[PDB]
Design a protein around this ligand. Structure first.
Ligand code: HEM
Length: 153
């Protein structure tokens, strides 16, 4: 359970993201695919991209980054009261997209790195710890749905 002060730190940096959702979404997906190439393999849509320059040039990748970050932003702004938003995401990522919980840990690491790069003055250690807590809560709650459905592994 995050405290109110931890949520304020999370949402204060998140407000900075929403000024350039698409640029953040590109940096986060590119970092994810570079750091953990097994993740790229889950996207039939993107698995033709073989270089970072090709990734940065893909408008479809940029569109998907906005889809991802729009869904995460709506979850974060519920401050933990996010059951309605996670249900459908857990269900599609477990049963259709086949995304292991561990890859949600990987995209969480990429989100944190990109926020630190783009927003250092609003992403000191207190805010990094709070965002880590928020992303852990996201993963915890998605993992409980995966386990229900027979996908926690
Ligand atoms: C913060 C974490 C994430 C969020 C909020 C998120 C959100 C979404 C949303 C909103 C969609 C479209 C609606 C749906 O299918 O449910 C989607 C699609 C998808 N996601 Fe995620 N996602 C996340 C992490 C990941 C990760 C880590 C992977 C793979 C390693 C992944 C793989 C996919 C795939 C394969 C699709 C379908 C893309 C397509 O072919 O159109 N997602 N995601």
């Amino acid at each position: 359970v995050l405290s109110e002060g931890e949520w304020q730190l999370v949402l204060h940096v998140w407000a900075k993201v929403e000024a350039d959702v698409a640029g953040h979404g590109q940096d986060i997906l590119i970092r994810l695919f570079k750091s953990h190439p097994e993740t790229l393999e889950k996207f039939d849509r993107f698995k033709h991209l073989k270089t970072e320059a090709e990734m940065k040039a893909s408008e479809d990748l940029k569109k998907h980054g906005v889809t991802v970050l729009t869904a995460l932003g709506a979850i974060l702004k519920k401050k933990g009261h996010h059951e309605a938003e996670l249900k459908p995401l857990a269900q599609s990522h477990a049963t259709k997209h086949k995304i292991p919980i561990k890859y949600l840990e990987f995209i969480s690491e990429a989100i944190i790195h990109v926020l630190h790069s783009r927003h250092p003055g609003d992403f000191g250690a207190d805010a990094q710890g709070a965002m880590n807590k928020a992303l852990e809560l996201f993963r915890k709650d998605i993992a409980a749905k995966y386990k229900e459905l027979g996908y926690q592994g």
